[PDB]
Amino acid sequence: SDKQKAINYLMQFAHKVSGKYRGVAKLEGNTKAKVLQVLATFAYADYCRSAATPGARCRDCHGTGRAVDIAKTKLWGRVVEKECGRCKGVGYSRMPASAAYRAVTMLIPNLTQPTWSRTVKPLYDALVVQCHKEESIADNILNAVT
Amino acid sequence: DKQKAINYLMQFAHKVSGKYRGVAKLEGNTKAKVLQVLATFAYADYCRSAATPGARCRDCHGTGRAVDIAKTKLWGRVVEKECGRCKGVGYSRMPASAAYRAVTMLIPNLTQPTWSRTVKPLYDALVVQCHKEESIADNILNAV
Ligand SMILES: [Cl-]
Ligand SMILES: [Cl-]
Ligand SMILES: [Cl-]
Ligand SMILES: [Zn+2]
Ligand SMILES: [Zn+2]
């Protein structure tokens, strides 16, 4: 419901950016749709578990890997980010991705893990971090002093 | 054993929830999920402090309290006073932002100031509850 809406939002984003990832960009339409749905479902679950589990994502950036660069934000008149110093940009554990790899191989049975790592997993990670970034923006808006 | 401790802390959070405006009126299902988050994160904060050298006061081991000897004798029950070494702080306070973010997934309109005034005091009470349980277990274990 609320979960399915968020998953659908994430699936639509996955389609928008899919052309950047060589392992999904040229799949047949029906397979591409199934793959992107798997990636969005696993990525959203990975995000949700990491936010609710103590220690499962970085406690300074809350998963985004990024922090505000105060001086550059002032200079440029827009939010400029830098790497999160605490997690040096990792944001969230990468171990849950193995489950997504297994689910994708059921749809792409010749996809090896190193080919996944280079050509598909970057989209999975783009989706996980997209969720942490959405949460950070929602928090910034909710708590603005203006 | 961890889940038992958290579930115990969760039940205590329910008992005292009425005293904290940010949880005392949540609807049954949401209230349970929020209190489970609070207990889970509070227990993790406690465990980190207990395991990290220097993260707790070496006299009170996190409770912020000491036994008032003269009042305990007068009243025939343990009566506490502020721990002198730490002036009642008990443990180094770490930011509770991760817990706040986990709660806001369940209560999307909860601002950080409202959290700080009306929910975070319960969170802090749950953390100290854990140090107090440890202290009682130690007292009982070492009573002659
Ligand atoms: Cl992987
Ligand atoms: Cl007392
Ligand atoms: Cl009392
Ligand atoms: Zn970080
Ligand atoms: Zn002390």
From Swiss-Prot, chain B:
Alphabetical keyword list: DNA-binding, Host-virus interaction, Metal-binding, Transcription, Transcription regulation, Transcription termination, Zinc, Zinc-finger
Residue(s) at site: Interaction with host rpoB: 40, 99, 104
Positions that bind Zn(2+): 57, 60, 83, 86
GO process annotations (BP): DNA-templated transcription termination; transcription antitermination
Highest taxon of the lineage: Viruses
Gene Ontology molecular-function annotations: DNA binding; zinc ion binding
Positions of unnamed zinc fingers: 57-86
Start-end of DNA-binding region: 110-131
Chain positions of site Interaction with host RNA polymerase sigma factor RPOD: 73
Effect of residue 128 to E: Increased suppressor activity
Family assignment from sequence similarity: Belongs to the phage antitermination Q type 2 family.
Assembly description: Interacts with host RPOB (via flap domain); this interaction renders host RNAP resistant to transcription pausing and allows it to read through termination signals. Interacts with host RNA polymerase sigma factor RPOD (via domain-4). Interacts with host NUSA (via N-terminus and AR2 domain); this interaction releases the autoinhibition of NUSA.
Function: Mediates the switch from middle to viral late gene expression by associating with host RNA polymerase (RNAP) so that the latter can read without pausing and through transcription terminators preceding late genes. Competes with host factor sigma 70 for binding to RPOB, the beta-subunit of host RNAP. To join the elongation complex, binds a specific DNA Q-binding element (QBE) and interacts with RNAP that is paused during early elongation. Participates in the lysis-lysogeny decision by activating the expression of the late lytic genes.
Name of the protein described by the UniProt record: Antitermination protein Q
